[PDB]
Amino acid sequence: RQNLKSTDRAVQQMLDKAKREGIQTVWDRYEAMKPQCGFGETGLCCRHCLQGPCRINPFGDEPKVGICGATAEVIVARGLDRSIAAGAAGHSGHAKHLAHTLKKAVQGKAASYMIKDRTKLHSIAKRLGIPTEGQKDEDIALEVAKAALADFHEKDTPVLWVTTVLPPSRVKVLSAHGLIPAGIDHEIAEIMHRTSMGCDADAQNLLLGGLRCSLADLAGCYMGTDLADILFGTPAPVVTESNLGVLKADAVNVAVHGHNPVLSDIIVSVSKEMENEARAAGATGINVVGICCTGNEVLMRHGIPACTHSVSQEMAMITGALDAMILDYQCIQPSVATIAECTGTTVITTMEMSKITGATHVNFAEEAAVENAKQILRLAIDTFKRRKGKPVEIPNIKTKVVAGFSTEAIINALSKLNANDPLKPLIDNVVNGNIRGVCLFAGCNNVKVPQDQNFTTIARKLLKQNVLVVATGCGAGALMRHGFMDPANVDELCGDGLKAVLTAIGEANGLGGPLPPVLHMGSCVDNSRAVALVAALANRLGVDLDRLPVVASAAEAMHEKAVAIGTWAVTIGLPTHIGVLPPITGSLPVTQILTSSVKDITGGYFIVELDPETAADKLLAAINERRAGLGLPW
Amino acid sequence: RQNLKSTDRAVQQMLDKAKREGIQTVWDRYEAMKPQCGFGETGLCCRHCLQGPCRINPFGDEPKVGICGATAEVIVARGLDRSIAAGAAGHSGHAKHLAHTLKKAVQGKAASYMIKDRTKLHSIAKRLGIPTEGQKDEDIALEVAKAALADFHEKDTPVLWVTTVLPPSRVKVLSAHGLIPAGIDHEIAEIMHRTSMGCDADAQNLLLGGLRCSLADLAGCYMGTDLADILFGTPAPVVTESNLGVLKADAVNVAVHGHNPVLSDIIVSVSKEMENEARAAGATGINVVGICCTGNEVLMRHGIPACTHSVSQEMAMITGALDAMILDYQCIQPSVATIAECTGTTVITTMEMSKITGATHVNFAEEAAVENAKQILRLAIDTFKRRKGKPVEIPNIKTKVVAGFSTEAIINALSKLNANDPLKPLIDNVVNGNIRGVCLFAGCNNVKVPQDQNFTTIARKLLKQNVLVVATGCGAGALMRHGFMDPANVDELCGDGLKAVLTAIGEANGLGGPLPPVLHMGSCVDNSRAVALVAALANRLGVDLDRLPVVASAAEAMHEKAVAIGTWAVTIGLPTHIGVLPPITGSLPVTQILTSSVKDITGGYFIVELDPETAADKLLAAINERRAGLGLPW
Ligand code: SF4
Ligand code: SF4
Ligand code: F3S
Ligand code: F3S
Ligand code: FES
Ligand code: FES
Ligand SMILES: [Fe+3]
Ligand SMILES: [Fe+3]
Ligand code: NI
Ligand code: NI
């Protein structure tokens, strides 16, 4: 009964193949882990010194307190803070990589890279206060890259990728509570210090530190999107496909998996050059497909089809047709390196700090990107040749996907209804009830939740209640694989008011039809695009973000990055649903801060709800409360 | 049977008082924690994503692998790496605080602070390559503080507080393996990234990252010592006392506890001004005493007596005579805030990122240090008044302590035997066998080990075998409280060869007697002083550190900081004993790297040995192997 594992039919088909072939999957490893430790599940475990491990019984008798005296409050808050810091370390490390790549490009040290989006470069410079008049583009970009790198450490200004991206009124609220980050890596290190043994031991103080570190994560996300748009182009609407049926038995199938477009973007361009080399090997060409966020990056910019996402990533290999899986970092199940010996896939790592035992490592250097890409793709071609005559089982299952909804693209689409006040048509339809509010779906799948079940269940209820739904990361992946990015499904999925708006915008954009039911705003760093849209709406309305009828849902969250994103969503003022249990329930005081008293600090708050129908009701109630606070009908 | 808890008689006496008074201690909380989790003890637990908690059975059947596919190797190495990063975050955060204090002082923004050690300032500038000729001291110091802050982030040079403090041959070895840190907070963040889910998953690669992050920790330690010496004076030999008998019933007893001399040094100076204000309240004066590293800082510089250390810190409060405990950060059991309601002690926090629920917080700002110190001390005076007429139980137990052996002071002492080649008398006596080798004792006590039993057992065996013993942190605390810093105990404790050398040096220093059996080199950051001494010996000999008969022992380690120090001791080339089990035994491959194959990378290696007699034998064997490698008798 594979429907309990994934709601995606293509994944179900590959689970049947993996089972008959004896290939262990993430779901099998989860089953073998049950029952999981109740101390860890509730957050009541600490290993922060060698007197541990310490634990606290959720209920009953001793142990009641850690060996050093750490209470349940402290232990829970310290663990949570470390998870936020780890997420911030990932999103911002990605951004740092892109900042160094941009610097190299404009210094003449990496000619495979360039300023592709001159408009984005100039806007970012203007947002940061960097002068552009009479300056060469390469000098403007050098100053932007320098500013990006400076935000990682203390200096005479706070993190500009926070203070220049949120409205002044929100910055003032955050500053009053000491929550503006001083430097991205500075805050990460301060979290690791304050949570080490014998340091911070006050739950409120620890959690305020966590909120501030979550804003360091936001800055890394926003910096990542800004720099990737400069280097690779700001997305605009594009049509493609998703799910395993995008693999082609007669092509060299190459998955790009991981996170950074510095790698996946070059793979895409070089693969086109090597088409004739692929044909010589008996393929039709090189079919690049996406997994996880780096797949989202090349889908959003180039229309590269998405193969799969998150928890089901091993299933692409089980088809037998995946000739290469090209990795950089984050969210890659290390099982891929062993499964590859059963499936024939060549798994290739490329980043010095992210290797997997048993995978081939091909160092990638931006200074040699094209040559390193050809080396990698030639391994894929050789692998295609090795499977000559082997049957493959690619599920013949795919959906149509309209994506590429950057904030610039959303504003442009709306400008066709109101050229000089593009946000007004959206606001008009929020006021008249055709749009009840906005919900951002973000984050991962998680093996504890039947894959995609929370995303689709919640999305369907919100869409029927006229909520404008936007999505990023593997939430966008879930929704695309279930048809939520195909405009042909607007009639079935959308309430009448929402359908009217999607249709009006689409017809003004010449489509003869509507925008898709859900707007794909990109990768996990591109949650920063949703911030840009929400901040622009707040600024246009003259209100702070905690008065807007906008919510977020990390409906199947997994990674430390998703915890960090959820936390900065709360910190900027949003009601934020999480559909899995974070390790907080072992402390009622911590849970009460994160779900209730934080409202009095930032206006946002977590909504912890594992039942998706109930979560949808709670998200609708949060939206409707905001509408009432603005004096609107609901 | 309190001897199973601590070998310190004063601690035993206070344990009896705490038991009859019903005051729960760290030992009681440990007992309540037993049996501790075997997954955590062995390192085979992972909570790095919300699919967890994951665990791996050390032996037997499933679970055998984490849900994402993470092996035991990966899980163990990732946990270890996070501990190193957390330690680095603490030592280097301390150093960053001091760098900002020095900058403020010389900019005229904090007149309670100043350049006290002009000689140290100029030497550091010369070591770093900063010009001094024709420059004002305040400008030289501004450049030193700027250089310190720059080492936290990437720049055009690597971390100078690594590359300028180790010999070029060692830097070359480390560079060849990619182990030189690029920036202190940069490496901390990169560890948190690479150890997050779906990133680095190769044990060797992860551990190389850990070694590099341990060098970021070394840089933070060395920077902390350098800056504290500039601001507060480089230590020189001083005579004082240790143990609870240094408390005085008729004085206002104030403990400084935590880490940074930016706080404890001002408390010491202001307390002297407030003597008459204390007498008005009926005290004889203010008796400042030390706990943990900040106590070591003021002991080394000012001869402030040490009250207690590490695991036994609560016992100072149990006397009933501790009027205030002034805290900044690190290694403070948060139980102190609750015990204070039973003992009457005023526990005061002072740093924004290190608060304890139930303790009074008095913000300390360097710009207002004197006024903030008087506010704090007036709380202590009021507390002294409240205990008028209450009996106290101060154990009448103390030892004499000769300390203050900075590397400068050791070189000066040796220069009395050879003025222009001060290291030669030490080397001469290593060659002739009067000194078998050198052992650094470092790190914490740990409730799992009867307090001080490993430090004293190992030290006694090494001293009888003519090993020169140096000590820092709570290893120095253990040895001082058991008489190892009293020169009257040289005859009892030291082998004939070592006694001869300690006597020759002491008599050349006008003492009419020997140096003490163990040389106190200061706080935990002052492990960097041992590096300076060992690097100077290596440079004088023309060999790398991994050929010297020098070892280290973290005989009762606890904190993540101690893991980081142990790891950089291995990385710079030392055989390094740890006397508690770090969470590594669940992976034989990881254990084999850390105890064996790392020898081929750095020349150092861990010696994991919980039995102290056996650990002493293993340390002696390591020393003697080094002697043989140099062609010396042993
Ligand atoms: S920090 Fe405290 S609670 Fe955590 S392992 Fe150490 S003694 Fe236990
Ligand atoms: S990172 Fe892997 S091993 Fe760790 S909790 Fe997540 S699924 Fe389990
Ligand atoms: S790329 Fe990773 S952070 Fe979550 S959204 Fe997808 S599993
Ligand atoms: S101050 Fe702390 S790091 Fe260990 S050496 Fe003492 S318990
Ligand atoms: S006791 Fe299971 S997570 Fe630590
Ligand atoms: S299962 Fe006990 S430390 Fe996690
Ligand atoms: Fe992602
Ligand atoms: Fe210390
Ligand atoms: Ni994500
Ligand atoms: Ni220490």
Curated annotation (Swiss-Prot), chains A, B:
Cofactors demanded by this protein: [4Fe-4S] cluster; [Ni-4Fe-5S] cluster
UniProt cross-references to Gene3D superfamilies, sorted A to Z: 1.20.1270.30, 3.40.50.2030
Cross-referenced InterPro entries: CO_DH_a-bundle, CODH, HCP/CODH, Prismane-like_a/b-sand, Prismane-like_sf
GO biological process: generation of precursor metabolites and energy; response to hydrogen peroxide
GO cellular component, one term: plasma membrane
Statement: the UniProt record of this protein carries the keyword Oxidoreductase: yes
Membrane topology listed for this record: Peripheral membrane protein
Predominant location category: cytoplasm
A GO MF term: nickel cation binding
Positions that bind [4Fe-4S] cluster 1: C37, C45
Domain of life, source organism: Bacteria
Cofactor remark from the record: Binds 3 [4Fe-4S] clusters per homodimer.
Reaction(s) catalysed (UniProt annotation): CO + 2 oxidized [2Fe-2S]-[ferredoxin] + H2O = 2 reduced [2Fe-2S]-[ferredoxin] + CO2 + 2 H(+)
This enzyme's EC code(s): 1.2.7.4
Activity regulation comment: Inactivated by O(2).
Residues annotated to bind [Ni-4Fe-5S] cluster: H259, C293, C331, C444, C474, C524
Keywords for the protein's UniProt record, in alphabetical order: 4Fe-4S, Cell membrane, Cytoplasm, Iron, Iron-sulfur, Membrane, Metal-binding, Nickel, Oxidoreductase
Compartment list: Cytoplasm; Cell membrane
Amino acids binding [4Fe-4S] cluster 2: C46, C49, C54, C68
Record flagged with keyword Iron: yes
Family: Belongs to the Ni-containing carbon monoxide dehydrogenase family.
PANTHER family: CARBON MONOXIDE DEHYDROGENASE, HYDROXYLAMINE REDUCTASE
Domain topic, free-text comment: Cluster B is an all-cysteinyl-liganded 4Fe-4S cluster; cluster C is a mixed Ni-Fe-S cluster which is the active site of CO oxidation. Cluster D is also an all-cysteinyl-liganded 4Fe-4S cluster that bridges the two subunits of the CODH dimer.
Subunit structure: Homodimer.
Role played: CODH oxidizes carbon monoxide coupled, via CooF, to the reduction of a hydrogen cation by a hydrogenase (possibly CooH).
Record-given protein name: Carbon monoxide dehydrogenase 2
Organism field: Carboxydothermus hydrogenoformans (strain ATCC BAA-161 / DSM 6008 / Z-2901)
